[PDB]
Amino acid sequence: VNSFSGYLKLTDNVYIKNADIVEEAKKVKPTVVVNAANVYLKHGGGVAGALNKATNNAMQVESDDYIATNGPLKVGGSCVLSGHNLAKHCLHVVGPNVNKGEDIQLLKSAYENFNQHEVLLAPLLSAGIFGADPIHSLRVCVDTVRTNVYLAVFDKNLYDKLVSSFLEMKS
Ligand SMILES: Nc1ncnc2c1nc(Br)n2[C@@H]1O[C@H](COP(=O)(O)OP(=O)(O)OC[C@H]2O[C@@H](O)[C@H](O)[C@@H]2O)[C@@H](O)[C@H]1O
């Protein structure tokens, strides 16, 4: 497991690839895929829906059951559930929905959950439906995470922008 290939090494522990996270997960068989979740684990568009659909909706049913007996998550919080056919585990992480005025500082809280895991396959938290700048999310990630994080960015134009921006700001 955890056979990541073709990543660009950004820091000693952060790696980035222009790849759909679902197909990376099928290729790599990671111990942990990260899901960019909301506090009720209602997997809408974005990564959550793609992950859910690849589990034939088993992730959404598992999430319903988790929520029924544990209640919703906190922004910046997380929960480990099954990774189903994609990974051993899925780490569901709630970044701030910046479009709704939730504290963007909670992005640091969200990425801090990655530190509980040796190696993760992850998307950029809050950078899509939740409206954070993807460059800011990559920055928080490289600043906050100390464990090995392999970031999947499916859109080639965004990936190119992220690498360029990371170079310039790394100085
Ligand atoms: N197949 C893919 N492989 C790789 N990267 C992907 C893929 N698809 C997308 Br899209 N991305 C990119 O991963 C980033 C995060 O976007 P996101 O919307 O999934 O996560 P949040 O902004 O935290 O919103 C959470 C809310 O969205 C609902 O899904 C969830 O239930 C919740 O209510 C963005 O850069 C986006 O371009």
Resolution of the experimental structure, in angstroms: 2.1
For this PDB entry, the determination method is: X-ray
The H or E element that residue 90 is part of is strand 89-94
Nearest 5°: phi and psi at 17?
A: -145, 140
DSSP string, 23-68: HHHHHH--SEEEEEE-TT----SHHHHHHHHHTTTHHHHHHHHHHH
Contact 21 CB / ligand 1 (< 6 Å)? yes
Please state whether beta strands 148-153 and 89-94 pair in parallel, antiparallel, or not at all (unpaired): unpaired
Query: Where along the chain do its domains lie?
Result: 8-171
Give me the CATH code for the 8-171 domain, please.
Answer: 3.40.220.10
Contact 107 CB / ligand 1 (< 6 Å)? no
Which atom of ligand 1 is the closest one to the Cα of 47? 19
DSSP string, 93-111: EE---GGGT--TTHHHHHH
Classify burial at 131, counting beta carbons within 10 Å of its beta carbon; exposed 0-12, middle 13-18, buried 19 or more. Answer: middle
Q: Are 6 and 16 in contact (CB under 8 A)?
A: no
